[PDB]
Amino acid sequence: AKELTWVAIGDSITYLNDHLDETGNRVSKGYLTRLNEILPNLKYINQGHNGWTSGGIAGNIDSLGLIKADVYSVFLGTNDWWQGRPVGKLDDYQHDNGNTTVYGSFRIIISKIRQLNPEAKIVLITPMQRNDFVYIADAKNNAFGSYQKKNGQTLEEFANAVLTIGRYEQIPVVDLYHHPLLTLRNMVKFKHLKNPKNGKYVNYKYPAFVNIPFNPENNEYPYPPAAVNLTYDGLHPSDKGNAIIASALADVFRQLGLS
Ligand SMILES: [Cl-]
Protein backbone atom coordinates (compact mmCIF):
# COMPACT_ATOMS: atom_id res chain seq x y z
CA ALA A 1 0.00 0.00 0.00
CA LYS A 2 3.05 2.24 -0.62
CA GLU A 3 3.54 2.73 3.13
CA LEU A 4 6.46 5.00 3.97
CA THR A 5 7.73 5.97 7.41
CA TRP A 6 8.42 9.71 7.56
CA VAL A 7 10.44 11.21 10.41
CA ALA A 8 9.71 14.93 10.76
CA ILE A 9 12.59 16.62 12.57
CA GLY A 10 11.87 20.11 13.78
CA ASP A 11 11.14 22.65 16.49
CA SER A 12 7.81 23.86 17.94
CA ILE A 13 6.26 24.28 14.49
CA THR A 14 6.61 20.49 14.11
CA TYR A 15 6.11 19.57 17.77
CA LEU A 16 2.74 21.34 17.97
CA ASN A 17 1.17 19.02 15.38
CA ASP A 18 0.45 16.61 18.21
CA HIS A 19 0.00 19.07 21.07
CA LEU A 20 -2.79 21.33 19.91
CA ASP A 21 -3.66 22.21 23.52
CA GLU A 22 -0.38 24.17 23.56
CA THR A 23 -1.74 26.39 20.77
CA GLY A 24 -4.59 27.29 23.13
CA ASN A 25 -6.65 25.16 20.75
CA ARG A 26 -6.30 27.88 18.11
CA VAL A 27 -5.15 25.14 15.72
CA SER A 28 -7.11 22.01 14.79
CA LYS A 29 -4.68 20.32 12.36
CA GLY A 30 -0.91 20.71 12.17
CA TYR A 31 1.21 20.31 9.05
CA LEU A 32 2.12 16.63 9.64
CA THR A 33 -1.56 15.71 9.94
CA ARG A 34 -2.41 17.74 6.85
CA LEU A 35 0.47 16.25 4.84
CA ASN A 36 -0.83 12.78 5.66
CA GLU A 37 -4.32 13.73 4.47
CA ILE A 38 -2.84 14.66 1.10
CA LEU A 39 -0.49 11.65 0.98
CA PRO A 40 -2.15 8.95 3.11
CA ASN A 41 0.69 6.45 2.63
CA LEU A 42 3.08 8.75 4.52
CA LYS A 43 3.20 7.75 8.19
CA TYR A 44 4.65 10.53 10.30
CA ILE A 45 6.85 10.35 13.34
CA ASN A 46 6.95 13.62 15.24
CA GLN A 47 10.56 14.51 16.04
CA GLY A 48 9.73 18.16 16.65
CA HIS A 49 11.28 19.47 19.84
CA ASN A 50 9.59 22.45 21.44
CA GLY A 51 11.86 25.47 21.53
CA TRP A 52 14.95 23.74 20.16
CA THR A 53 17.57 25.12 17.81
CA SER A 54 19.33 23.10 15.12
CA GLY A 55 22.22 23.30 17.60
CA GLY A 56 20.17 21.49 20.24
CA ILE A 57 18.97 18.88 17.78
CA ALA A 58 22.52 18.26 16.51
CA GLY A 59 23.99 18.33 20.02
CA ASN A 60 21.59 15.63 21.19
CA ILE A 61 21.41 13.79 17.89
CA ASP A 62 22.28 10.32 19.27
CA SER A 63 19.81 10.61 22.16
CA LEU A 64 16.56 11.52 20.40
CA GLY A 65 15.37 7.99 19.72
CA LEU A 66 15.62 8.62 15.99
CA ILE A 67 14.82 5.45 14.07
CA LYS A 68 15.42 4.12 10.58
CA ALA A 69 12.81 5.54 8.19
CA ASP A 70 12.14 6.00 4.49
CA VAL A 71 12.13 9.80 4.40
CA TYR A 72 13.30 12.52 6.77
CA SER A 73 12.34 16.18 6.74
CA VAL A 74 14.30 18.80 8.66
CA PHE A 75 12.53 22.03 9.60
CA LEU A 76 14.87 24.05 11.83
CA GLY A 77 16.48 27.43 12.15
CA THR A 78 13.95 29.93 13.45
CA ASN A 79 15.10 29.42 17.04
CA ASP A 80 18.75 29.57 15.99
CA TRP A 81 18.02 32.98 14.51
CA TRP A 82 16.27 34.26 17.63
CA GLN A 83 19.11 33.00 19.84
CA GLY A 84 21.71 34.69 17.64
CA ARG A 85 23.58 31.50 16.68
CA PRO A 86 26.06 32.12 13.88
CA VAL A 87 24.85 30.87 10.52
CA GLY A 88 28.38 30.01 9.46
CA LYS A 89 29.48 29.18 5.93
CA LEU A 90 29.34 26.17 3.61
CA ASP A 91 32.84 25.22 4.85
CA ASP A 92 31.22 24.46 8.23
CA TYR A 93 28.94 21.99 6.49
CA GLN A 94 31.71 20.43 4.39
CA HIS A 95 34.12 19.99 7.28
CA ASP A 96 33.86 19.16 10.97
CA ASN A 97 34.38 22.47 12.74
CA GLY A 98 32.13 21.40 15.59
CA ASN A 99 28.48 22.09 16.38
CA THR A 100 29.18 25.83 16.41
CA THR A 101 27.17 27.15 13.46
CA VAL A 102 23.91 26.38 11.70
CA TYR A 103 25.76 24.89 8.72
CA GLY A 104 27.69 22.73 11.22
CA SER A 105 24.49 21.54 12.90
CA PHE A 106 23.02 20.54 9.56
CA ARG A 107 26.18 18.56 8.81
CA ILE A 108 25.65 16.62 12.04
CA ILE A 109 21.93 16.09 11.40
CA ILE A 110 22.24 14.99 7.78
CA SER A 111 25.14 12.71 8.68
CA LYS A 112 23.03 11.03 11.38
CA ILE A 113 20.17 10.50 8.93
CA ARG A 114 22.51 8.82 6.46
CA GLN A 115 23.88 6.63 9.25
CA LEU A 116 20.32 5.60 10.18
CA ASN A 117 19.38 4.92 6.57
CA PRO A 118 21.76 5.71 3.69
CA GLU A 119 18.82 5.06 1.31
CA ALA A 120 16.33 7.42 2.93
CA LYS A 121 15.04 10.51 1.14
CA ILE A 122 15.81 13.85 2.76
CA VAL A 123 13.90 17.12 2.49
CA LEU A 124 14.92 20.41 4.11
CA ILE A 125 12.42 23.15 4.97
CA THR A 126 13.46 26.80 5.31
CA PRO A 127 12.20 28.80 8.26
CA MET A 128 8.97 30.67 7.68
CA GLN A 129 8.95 34.42 8.15
CA ARG A 130 7.70 35.46 11.56
CA ASN A 131 6.14 38.58 12.97
CA ASP A 132 6.23 39.73 16.60
CA PHE A 133 5.78 36.62 18.72
CA VAL A 134 3.97 36.56 22.06
CA TYR A 135 3.70 33.21 23.85
CA ILE A 136 0.06 32.32 24.48
CA ALA A 137 0.83 30.71 27.86
CA ASP A 138 3.16 33.49 29.09
CA ALA A 139 3.30 36.89 27.38
CA LYS A 140 6.63 37.72 29.07
CA ASN A 141 8.04 35.25 26.56
CA ASN A 142 8.07 37.32 23.40
CA ALA A 143 10.25 38.23 20.40
CA PHE A 144 10.36 40.72 17.56
CA GLY A 145 9.61 39.76 13.96
CA SER A 146 12.00 38.95 11.13
CA TYR A 147 11.69 42.49 9.73
CA GLN A 148 14.54 43.24 12.20
CA LYS A 149 18.01 41.72 12.57
CA LYS A 150 18.89 39.70 15.63
CA ASN A 151 22.54 39.87 16.62
CA GLY A 152 23.41 41.22 13.17
CA GLN A 153 21.69 38.41 11.27
CA THR A 154 18.47 38.30 9.26
CA LEU A 155 16.23 35.26 9.31
CA GLU A 156 16.63 35.23 5.54
CA GLU A 157 20.30 34.29 6.02
CA PHE A 158 19.12 31.13 7.77
CA ALA A 159 16.76 30.30 4.90
CA ASN A 160 19.61 30.92 2.47
CA ALA A 161 21.92 28.56 4.37
CA VAL A 162 19.30 25.80 4.13
CA LEU A 163 18.89 26.51 0.41
CA THR A 164 22.67 26.40 -0.04
CA ILE A 165 22.96 23.02 1.73
CA GLY A 166 20.11 21.70 -0.40
CA ARG A 167 21.85 22.79 -3.60
CA TYR A 168 25.18 21.34 -2.44
CA GLU A 169 23.73 17.94 -1.53
CA GLN A 170 21.13 17.90 -4.32
CA ILE A 171 18.50 17.63 -1.59
CA PRO A 172 15.10 19.22 -2.24
CA VAL A 173 14.19 22.26 -0.16
CA VAL A 174 10.73 23.55 0.68
CA ASP A 175 11.31 27.30 0.66
CA LEU A 176 8.76 28.70 3.09
CA TYR A 177 10.77 31.89 3.61
CA HIS A 178 10.27 32.98 0.00
CA HIS A 179 6.82 31.44 -0.41
CA PRO A 180 4.65 34.10 -2.09
CA LEU A 181 1.77 33.44 0.33
CA LEU A 182 3.81 33.46 3.54
CA THR A 183 4.40 37.19 4.03
CA LEU A 184 4.90 39.28 7.19
CA ARG A 185 1.75 41.31 6.56
CA ASN A 186 -0.27 38.09 6.71
CA MET A 187 1.13 36.63 9.92
CA VAL A 188 -1.42 38.31 12.22
CA LYS A 189 -4.39 40.64 11.60
CA PHE A 190 -3.47 43.05 14.40
CA LYS A 191 -1.86 43.44 17.79
CA HIS A 192 -4.30 44.47 20.54
CA LEU A 193 -2.42 47.23 22.37
CA LYS A 194 -2.87 50.21 24.64
CA ASN A 195 -2.55 53.54 22.87
CA PRO A 196 0.27 55.41 24.65
CA LYS A 197 -1.61 58.71 24.30
CA ASN A 198 -4.69 57.67 26.26
CA GLY A 199 -4.29 54.16 27.69
CA LYS A 200 -7.18 52.78 25.64
CA TYR A 201 -6.98 49.57 23.61
CA VAL A 202 -6.56 49.83 19.84
CA ASN A 203 -6.25 47.25 17.05
CA TYR A 204 -2.93 48.02 15.34
CA LYS A 205 -2.23 46.09 12.16
CA TYR A 206 1.25 45.61 10.71
CA PRO A 207 3.39 47.64 10.30
CA ALA A 208 1.76 50.08 12.74
CA PHE A 209 2.18 47.74 15.66
CA VAL A 210 5.95 47.81 15.37
CA ASN A 211 5.79 51.37 16.68
CA ILE A 212 3.53 50.69 19.68
CA PRO A 213 5.01 49.38 22.94
CA PHE A 214 3.81 46.08 24.34
CA ASN A 215 4.17 45.77 28.10
CA PRO A 216 3.04 42.27 29.14
CA GLU A 217 2.39 43.50 32.70
CA ASN A 218 0.14 46.35 31.52
CA ASN A 219 -1.57 44.84 28.46
CA GLU A 220 -3.94 41.92 27.85
CA TYR A 221 -2.73 39.17 25.50
CA PRO A 222 -2.23 41.09 22.26
CA TYR A 223 -3.36 38.34 19.85
CA PRO A 224 -7.04 37.52 20.53
CA PRO A 225 -8.75 34.95 18.23
CA ALA A 226 -9.69 37.66 15.70
CA ALA A 227 -5.98 38.33 15.13
CA VAL A 228 -5.24 34.89 13.68
CA ASN A 229 -4.07 34.81 10.07
CA LEU A 230 -1.11 32.67 8.94
CA THR A 231 -0.10 32.35 12.60
CA TYR A 232 -2.00 32.48 15.89
CA ASP A 233 0.77 34.22 17.86
CA GLY A 234 3.08 35.83 15.30
CA LEU A 235 5.22 32.73 14.86
CA HIS A 236 3.39 29.41 14.99
CA PRO A 237 1.18 28.52 12.02
CA SER A 238 -2.58 28.64 12.14
CA ASP A 239 -4.70 26.04 10.37
CA LYS A 240 -4.27 28.18 7.24
CA GLY A 241 -0.49 28.38 7.67
CA ASN A 242 -0.22 24.62 8.25
CA ALA A 243 -2.27 23.92 5.12
CA ILE A 244 0.09 26.00 2.96
CA ILE A 245 3.14 24.31 4.48
CA ALA A 246 1.66 20.83 4.02
CA SER A 247 0.80 21.54 0.37
CA ALA A 248 4.33 22.76 -0.38
CA LEU A 249 5.79 19.71 1.35
CA ALA A 250 3.44 17.37 -0.50
CA ASP A 251 4.65 18.74 -3.85
CA VAL A 252 8.25 17.90 -2.96
CA PHE A 253 7.33 14.43 -1.69
CA ARG A 254 5.55 13.84 -5.01
CA GLN A 255 8.61 14.95 -6.99
CA LEU A 256 10.70 12.50 -4.96
CA GLY A 257 8.38 9.68 -6.02
CA LEU A 258 6.86 9.17 -2.57
CA SER A 259 3.19 9.52 -3.57
CL1 LIG B 1 4.51 10.12 16.67
CATH code of the domain in which 41 resides: 3.40.50.1110
Greatest CA separation for the chain: 64
Strands 42-48 and 71-75: unpaired
Distance in Å, CA 54 to ligand 1 centroid:
20
C-alpha distances in angstroms, 91 versus 104, 153, 159? 9, 18, 17
Helices (H), the chain: 12-15, 31-38, 54-59, 78-83, 90-94, 102-116, 155-169, 239-255
Query: What single letter denotes the amino acid at residue 236?
Result: H
Experimental method: X-ray
| DSSP-assigned letter for residue 222 | S
- Residue 104 CA to residue 87 CA, distance in Å, equals 9
Q: 25 C-alpha vs ligand 1 centroid, how far in Å?
A: 19
Q: Which amino acid is at 75?
A: F
CA angle 16, 44, 166 (to 5 degrees): 90
71: three-class secondary structure by DSSP: strand
CA distance 159 to 125: 8
Give the residue among 37, 176, 30, 169 at the shortest CA–CA distance from 113: 169
| Cα dist from 165 to 47, 76, 120, whole Å | 21, 13, 17
Instruction: Provide the residues around ligand 1 (an ion) whose CB is within 5 A.
Output: 45-46
3 state DSSP class of 66: coil
Distance CA 245, CA 232 (A): 15
Query: Residue 258's domain spans which residues?
Result: 1-259
**Cα separation, 171 vs 141, whole angstroms:** 35
Cα of 46 from ligand 1 centre, angstroms = 4
Q: How far is CA 114 from the centre of its chain?
A: 23
**Structural domains counted in the chain:** 1
**Helix or strand or coil: residue 220?**
coil
Q: Ligand 1 center to residue 48 CA distance, Å?
A: 10
CA of 45 from ligand 1 middle (Å) equals: 4
